[PDB]
């Protein structure tokens, strides 16, 4: 009996009844699933074509994907639900929208084209025991009608936004675009403005004025598109595993990247709570709809004058809302939009409506007063079940050092350049000394590498930098190519040169490149 | 009791009844077969005459065919269903369209000319225990009417496209053509745009600008022909077992070839699932047709006013669809095309239609809710029954090496050129030393060849390259001609020359050539 | 009495009468101007924001503009009509749309916002005595309605396209976009598909596959947007006065650039002729409209049944066109579009129409038979009035050499490196020797520079390369900074290094940079 189990149980037992009785599923959102409870915290990543969302997710992962490939070209022709799988592989969308332990059984409504353009990528990763990431198809910039798609992208994105932990909106400076498809998409995101984080990628490859006013043009457009004057927090930088192109704004890029990274790191202890958040949200909206329907039903006459009475009631709907607020003490922010309720109301026959049943309303109030109250202690006890999503480093970060310290000035630390093989900075003679070091299974162990490259008499900080740069697979042990790269850096330092913070793919071994 | 058996059983038990009752077989697609379930994953290969589809399939196979022959001339006068046979041979089309364990009993509708221009090629191959490949006749470029053929090629190709795992569309740069026959064929492929992969062959024999703008002309034409603005993924390269003509775009050719190869390699764990995919597709379409027919039947009056009522109903059909969607909560993408339903409806007498039978609709909904749910565990347990289609290498690839390593720099590896018979680079004196090596059955064993050609004191990587180039039959053991070719390469390296990545037919032994 | 004077005179005398009589100005295009005749050959340059149209025009010019500034940011907030002015300066749009010797009096229709966002840039240039160039505002990619602009951009662009010599459509690989604004703009360009040249800029800064498939995406989109299956010639390259970023496709870039350059060079002897071309075009369209109006007027009854007769005639319009073609022997390609004629016809009162006047039709036929015939000899005599637009080189091209030969192997040519001041490769000591050479007005004359830098004993070809690289202002004489740059190149060659084909702004003197 977990708190998630309690939430789903209370829902299925006594929120679904009024939902089905008053067709809340036919007005705002259909009946929920066990998935929205059993699912892990989730990050949904949207953006137009060629933005680099695949690059973003792989940079977060430090690992490639079973299904999806990085490309500056539009390759994301389908949604990618990358999640924790026991074995490397993938599973399609019609089998994803049914899977008991996946958040997506309620996507079966859209069906057909969405489920064929909907994929899942299962892999074991320490990020993935924590989260699942939904890479959306690149939002089209070809000025396309909604009917041309085989599915309603606005509706699917709204369905996600009702449930996502964090929605990231990725815009690139090189191919800066603001499309009508994205515009109607963000109107689909209306109602959940908290979850959107706007991120400006590829800010390093352009000049200072170019970056300045591409940010400009984008966010003049955004100010009108969102229509909400509240400022949306931006993250300007290059989430990119390669060295910076222009270093004018490196400080700003790294600051924004770190801020976004920590904001993402805050979600694990946020995971069950926002389940409860959405539970309250839908409970209040459901009871407001219940009072609306009950008032309409009681105003419905028996058999005669029904057409005129309905015609009067549809126009009288606003003051009905005012009376409901006054006589039920319910906030004005819980009501749905009056005009939308209008067009949804004429489609219904008023005779079929159900009368007020106080049992449901009373027990929902009892929920909000006491069952969440009981579940609070369970939440506090379960606050540490999974605290460790994080935005991890990569193959080239200051944790890959392993048994090395980061930066310091010991006398047990040594001089800039004292020892390394000189002409052996070529691959075969790297391998000669690599195997005179007696490696195991073609791999020099961590301690053996320590004892060998401490004889280089280089400072321990820079030695750890060499290790973190070379050790691409991040197993804490050096292969042939990683050893060659490390001793390449050592020779370059002998000649006199500063170690790069992150190595380029050029210096990455060819087999270790993506 | 396999998952395929469960799928076919559930179909034949409770999807066929409504099909026959509401003549779904007379409107969209006839009743299915046990074949569509029992069949293996299948690749259907279409393209115009002289494109080289036979060359494609033989390159995938690394083996010739019982029936079909490669020719730059149009030789594919019949469909070729190449599949796994216990013995080398072939079997004709009227006996293929009946065979219990072949996907084609439903081709008997077209009959006569199609079945005479329909062939099967049975052979034992490791590719063929996994897949079957349908080489289509070269799509005619002679601007021909549909009536001139003895069969309806558009309808047969649609029937395939409803069931194929992967449909490949092959277009050649030399004889770049976009015909009206292929155009109406792709309109037959409408509805399954996922399965089409467009491949541009013979991209190496032409210049860079020539290749650039032949790709151009082809895909300007394709953009209008397909009429769907969604980008279709292209594969530009030379799927060709002979050395490249122009090496300007070799990187692009090999990248596209590898991407297509892996996409084909992904089908084995895709084989039963897309059976379930098509099952859902036809179930939803069948129930939508069922509601349409039921609504028409209930609107049908008893005996009088039938002509006027039918004339009104045929025009009223769209809002009937709208009402059906509203009152059954079924996606708009499940409906067939309104106008096509129109012309199909006037041909029918409305009195004969059957009334609504809730039993069938309820039990089909029960299917989609629970029987696929039960079969999911069986799918997961059977996910590894046959994972190994792959796009294998050939007679000249880096696996033919066998007991050799691929590329490396040991000291157990040796110098570029130290030993080989000099004037013996002619066939008879090759054979002299071939038999002084004491071969078995005219064949030098793998270990004997290893010990002999390691005394050549060449690097083990290049020795493995020599082995992979020479060993044409890929049995891991060298015959007289393969040994002669290997030692020819060794002598050429003594003289000083780079080993070709893939050997030309010129250097292929005359008996080992096709 | 020039041929242009004869053309404008014949127009104003006997094409305008039928135009005004049959309100051709109210249906297809208003009455022409003396401007369309007196104007010089003109290149109109369109493209979206940040494409670099200003960079294109300045690269063609080898000169900056009075009004418009280069910027990767959208700076073109107004049309720029850059033309030959006696003095450097600019003049606004409401005074440009009136000027007797400028092509734009007919832009006064649009008025207000267009004329305020319409500018003119007058400067003396050898390109500009030949042509005028219209830099359009960057076509907006913000998915904007037509009403939001203060003027009808589609209509203005159609008005230009009716009169332009060459319309260039510039699309950049970095920020590759295809907007709805540009889409409706090209539908405005419909009818003049000859004049469009599509140019893909910034093709050098991206990788080979990136460039390949950005060209792809652009021209899949273009194939549907233009809707005409006829191939439009593309020009892939970097029209850019700075050294290439990636040199993989330098040959293709320079080939396309040269082809486009020559196509532009062909316009001078094309200038009066296409005036005659548009004259014939509008004459044929005007007479076709005349027969249409005359037939409608004669079918118009006296006073009664007018409403029914007009209602019948508007639907009968197509067979009226067929009868007109049959009885007047006029090509079907001269008629306007039937449906457009429809909606334009209901707005008019049929009683007001004018009856057939054979005088106008007969004299227009007499025009097309005899007055163009008389003007042919004048055209042939005036074929060489201005043959020299050209697409000139720049500050760094193989004509700047002046008194130097380009590339050759004389013995009067000399060795790679024999003489130059060594440590004087810094600015002050450059100036020391610059003034020991006794320059005039701070400038070393061409002959003095020749005699000094021939003592360097470098080959005359490379010496000319040094001169063409250094001489930025292209006056054939070296200033202090140009001399410093030249002798910098000479010292670099002493050290041993290949001379760049075009110098970067980095090596361009700071005062000589833009």
Numbering used by the authors:
A (entry chain A), B (entry chain I), C (entry chain J): 22 to 535
Authors' description from the paper:
Eps15-homology domain containing proteins (EHDs) are eukaryotic, dynamin-related ATPases involved in cellular membrane trafficking. EHDs harbor a dynamin-related GTPase (G-) domain that binds to adenine rather than guanine nucleotides. EHDs tubulate negatively-charged liposomes in an ATP-dependent manner by the formation of ring-shaped and helical filaments on the remodeled membranes. EHD4/Pincher mediates macropinocytosis required for retrograde endosomal Trk signaling.
In the present work, we reconstitute an N-terminally truncated EHD4 variant on tubular membrane templates and determine these structures by cryo-electron tomography (cryo-ET) and subtomogram averaging (STA). Accordingly, our in vitro reconstitutions were done in the presence of the nonhydrolysable ATP analogue, adenylyl-imidodiphosphate (AMPPNP). The resulting cryo-electron microscopy (cryo-EM) density map had an average resolution of 7.6 Å and 8.5 Å, as determined by FSC and FSC-independent analyses, respectively. EHD4 formed right-handed helical filaments wrapping around the lipid tubes. The EH domains are located furthest from the membrane, the G-domains at the center and the helical domains closest to the membrane. As in the previously reported crystal structures, dimerization of EHD4 is mediated by helix α6 in the G-domain. Interface-2 is formed between the helical domain of one protomer and the G-domain of the adjacent protomer along the filament. Interface-3 is formed between G-domains of two adjacent dimers across the filament and corresponds to the archetypal G-interface that is conserved in all members of the dynamin family. Membrane-bound EHD4 adopted the closed conformation of the helical domain, akin to the reported EHD2 conformation. Thus, helices α8 and α9 in the helical domain engage with the membrane bilayer by inserting hydrophobic residues at the connecting loop into the membrane outer leaflet.
